[PDB]
Design a protein around this ligand. Structure first.
Ligand code: NAP
Ligand code: NAP
Ligand code: MG
Ligand code: MG
Lengths: 401, 401
């Protein structure tokens, strides 16, 4: 008989190459071994277009309801994408919508294998990116001021008190952006980071540009140093670990020379950019896990990479591709493990451990996708296309579940 | 007799460890060989505090007047710095003020030596960062909305027409930021980049997050692709080079695996962060040149690093330090060379070439500062403190100028 689940996983489907890979993973790696229960939400671009993005909201509310979600990579449309898919509008990122509704910190960690050396010489130990999931430019307002003018931010309190600040006054076409964050969300982000550091017994590094952004970035800096002082200094001391703060340009300079082995806390944008930098340097974009940890008790598992649009275009031309499904597999296994821990179904957790170990063993034994074959030592035995890779994982699972 | 100058250089002095190094460079490397003419502006934190930052404006106007400036690294004060120096207020960055008044693109290039391998394995050729010098969060408005409220951006045109967009409405303390850029400045940035690429025969890479920032970042993207199409596509084709655009997280992922050898165009913030990443990976923060190229014909030479605050603290404790003056020397030599090219005084340009070559030769022969000694192969012969390093350069110049 198959492994049973107590509570369904909330399943958010997606786009392009990852959409292609998603059913292969379920059909070959999960369904033969688990009577998989999920609440399914299709966040493909066409279904979001059809529902005016309502399906994205519905999926986020369902994660709140059940507690644990697993998300496939999605297209965030720009004007090229509006033309390409014939869209009603440039829909907001489904990641931005979901992350805003859950709140939290996205922990991104390289998935390491013995036959790939890091791009960065000194890196000997994993660097985890702790990415603030809330606010900043992921909920922006923007105006194209085609006739220029006085450009301002304006805050009106709930009793009508107005506070204004002028960005610039211009006599020419200009572009304008406004962003926000909240004291409470920044606070939950500091704590999530400090807790993660303690649990993993790693130092925590944080950086902003507080010299330039004196009320905004400096608030992050002050909140972290206050919360650390009042709540974590002694805990950290006791655990043999340290909190380090510096300016953002300095921190990335320092990072190129470190041995790694820390938690790098990052503001939302920085976390996006640097989780890609870190994943790439350690191996590839596919060799990274990503989990949003909400201060409200929710969890969301995902790949850190996107839809692999470029590979999807090759797929559309009838070509086999060698897109690496590792991150998508680890999103499923992370989510299923968490679900089985919360539900008290340890057989589910054990299978997740197995699938993960089998994924590593297969790559380390020399059967891998093209992203890893380019960078492994010694050279790969077989360079498997996406479906061949997944079939070999299913086979090792059938031979064990 | 000493080398003569026709037009003075505008000299902007600065802070902490770089302030210490500045007169050593002039006294030992320049003054014995050049009758150095400069218009001197002290942008030390105390002099800026005294003049309410007026000296910063005066120095910027003088660069406009003469055409070429050379700038020492300066403290941008946050609250720690206000406490530390007893300041009237958290003064705005002097770099932000000067750069705003000149406009342009800051070209940042590693200074390479044969005895230091890059941190990033694949990097075989220099990566140049082309950093937009104007706008974005380097001219921000910010509000700490302690009682929450409706958070907006507002544009009022010169005929009183109001355009509003809501960032968020909140029922809790929040922070608010607004930034701008101009179509014209973005345009001069694209062109400076495309011209630099053509002159240097290197590809140009650019990236933003236009999927998230749909009116702001997407304007940069559209401006670049329009200007390239209408003005550079054929020139680039003819030169054997290519323009590449992608999302910012993807570009840094791609960068960890490239052999280098391109111009990386960067929005202002990205350019700050990544020029540090690139300098560090190639060698150290000191092994990088930086020049602002204004579309109005001005030039400003500087180090890419800051004041080396941490070393200054060691200096204050009576300790010799091994701070690397290379970037400060290259700012002088870059500026003096440009001045002699504009003035028709080739003896000045020849000396700059000499000093630069002697700097490289000394390091490559094994006499270097501690930042390079940590990372060179084979190991250094002597690890020279800052003043000893500079004395050895003067000696080689005395033995040649
Ligand atoms: N939902 C998300 O988490 C998320 C995240 C990022 C992007 N996106 C969306 O994804 C779309 C494409 O974005 P993008 O091309 O910038 O980023 P991407 O999907 O992360 O892929 C960028 C490049 O990295 C390599 N790569 C990424 N994942 C890979 C994998 N699984 N296996 C092998 N190689 C992989 C490929 O490089 P090569 O081409 O050199 O092979 C790929 O073209 C956009 O519409 C964007 O909005 C969504
Ligand atoms: N004017 C500017 O261009 C500019 C630029 C950046 C920063 N700043 C200002 O500089 C102050 C300090 O900023 P920061 O410490 O973040 O950055 P920084 O001055 O660039 O120095 C950061 C670290 O990098 C290494 N480093 C930088 N320059 C070096 C050199 N010349 N020789 C040897 N090592 C060098 C040192 O690392 P180790 O400590 O490990 O030895 C140093 O502590 C702040 O007040 C900031 O506002 C100004
Ligand atoms: Mg990303
Ligand atoms: Mg910098």
């Amino acid at each position: 008989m198959k492994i049973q689940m107590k509570t369904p996983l909330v399943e958010l489907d997606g786009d392009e190459m990852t959409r292609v890979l998603w059913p292969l993973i379920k059909d070959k790696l999960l369904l033969p071994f688990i009577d998989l229960q999920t609440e399914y939400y299709d966040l493909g671009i066409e279904e979001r277009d059809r529902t005016n993005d309502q399906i994205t909201i519905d999926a986020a509310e369902a994660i709140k309801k059940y507690g644990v979600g697993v998300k496939n990579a999605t297209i965030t449309p720009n004007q090229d994408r509006v033309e390409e898919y014939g869209l009603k509008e440039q829909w907001k990122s489904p990641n931005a919508t979901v992350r805003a509704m859950l709140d939290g910190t996205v922990f991104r960690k390289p998935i390491m294998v013995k036959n790939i050396k890091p791009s960065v010489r000194s890196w000997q130990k994993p660097i985890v990116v702790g990415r603030h999931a809330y606010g900043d430019f992921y909920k922006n307002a923007e105006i194209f001021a085609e006739a220029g003018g006085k450009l301002e931010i304006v805050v009106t309190d709930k009793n009508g008190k107005e506070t204004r600040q002028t960005i610039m006054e211009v006599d020419e076409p200009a572009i304008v952006q406004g962003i926000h964050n909240t004291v409470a969300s920044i606070g939950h982000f500091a704590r999530a980071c400090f807790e993660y550091s303690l649990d993993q017994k790693i130092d925590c590094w944080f950086a902003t540009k507080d010299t330039i952004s004196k009320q905004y970035d400096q608030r992050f800096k002050i909140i972290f140093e206050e919360i650390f002082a009042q709540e974590y200094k002694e805990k950290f001391a006791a655990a043999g670990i340290e909190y380090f703060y510096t300016l953002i340009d300095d921190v990335v300079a320092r990072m190129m020379k470190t041995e790694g082995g820390m938690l790098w806390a990052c503001k939302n944008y920085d976390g996006d950019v640097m989780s890609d930098m870190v994943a790439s340097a350690f191996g590839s974009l596919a060799m990274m896990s990503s989990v949003l940890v909400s201060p409200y008790g929710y969890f969301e598992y995902e790949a850190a990479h996107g839809t692999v649009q470029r590979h999807y275009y090759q797929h559309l031309k009838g070509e086999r591709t060698s897109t690496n499904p590792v991150a998508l597999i680890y999103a499923w296994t992370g989510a299923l493990r968490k679900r089985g821990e919360l539900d008290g179904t340890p057989d589910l957790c054990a299978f997740c451990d197995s699938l993960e170990a089998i994924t590593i063993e297969c790559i380390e034994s020399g059967y891998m996708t093209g992203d890893l074959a380019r960078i492994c030592e010694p050279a790969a035995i077989k360079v498997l296309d996406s479906i061949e890779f997944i079939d070999e994982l299913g086979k090792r699972l059938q031979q064990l579940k």
